[PDB]
RNA sequence: UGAAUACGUUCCCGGGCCUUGUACACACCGCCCGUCACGCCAUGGGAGCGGGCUCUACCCGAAGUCGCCGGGAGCCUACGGGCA
């Protein structure tokens, strides 16, 4: 208790220049290796660059803002949580593939839709 | 390779520690209290029975004492008394 201790703070990726990615990267991390999650990553992110033309990251970063639920919230839990659904609502995808199952999840999420969206939606109009 | 969450955890499940107050107790997941079952002893009344004693009222027992009369042919000496 008290000193309101730490949370660290990371640094950006690579092509995109942002610390939430890496955080991202750590929800689809699994068994300890971030190396693979990174790649399922910006490959989630090619194709919806060659998708939809647009910046995979003006799309990422949207996406989690459009997921950032108001009621149920901390600037930060806003983050903790948003990136939770994203990772749920990717993991129950039909794509095979990881990255493809992202990409489209993050799409629609940056477009106020899916399931991950679905479920925000339900939160705070049961929490309203 | 390398997190997520860590302060709004002030609570609080739980442990430890300082401090306040209270009851019993110190085997403290205590201790007491009470009922029930068994054993022994003991207290009191009551319906009633047996024995002794006390108080009140009536019913006359004897000895003895006190008082009066006294038998008159009764038990007798006589200023007459008296005994029975």
């Known amino acids: 208790r008290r000193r309101r201790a730490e949370v660290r703070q990371l640094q950006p990726d690579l092509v995109y220049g942002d610390v939430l990615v890496t955080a991202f990267i750590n929800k689809i991390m699994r068994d300890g290796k ?13 194709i919806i660059q060659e998708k939809t033309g ?18 149920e919230v901390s ?12 990772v749920q609502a990717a993991n129950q995808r039909p794509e095979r593939r990881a990255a493809v199952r992202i990409a489209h999840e993050l799409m629609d999420a940056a477009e106020g839709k899916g399931g991950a969206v679905k479920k925000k939606e339900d939160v705070e109009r049961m929490a309203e």
Request: glycine share 0%; proline share 7%.
């Open 75 to 86: 600037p930060r839990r806003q983050q903790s949580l948003a990136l939770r659904w994203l």
């Open 34 to 46: 971030k190396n693979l999650a990174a790649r399922i990553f910006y490959d989630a992110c090619k």
């Open 54 to 71: 647009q910046e995979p990251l003006k799309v990422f970063k949207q996406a989690v803002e459009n997921v950032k639920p108001r009621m």
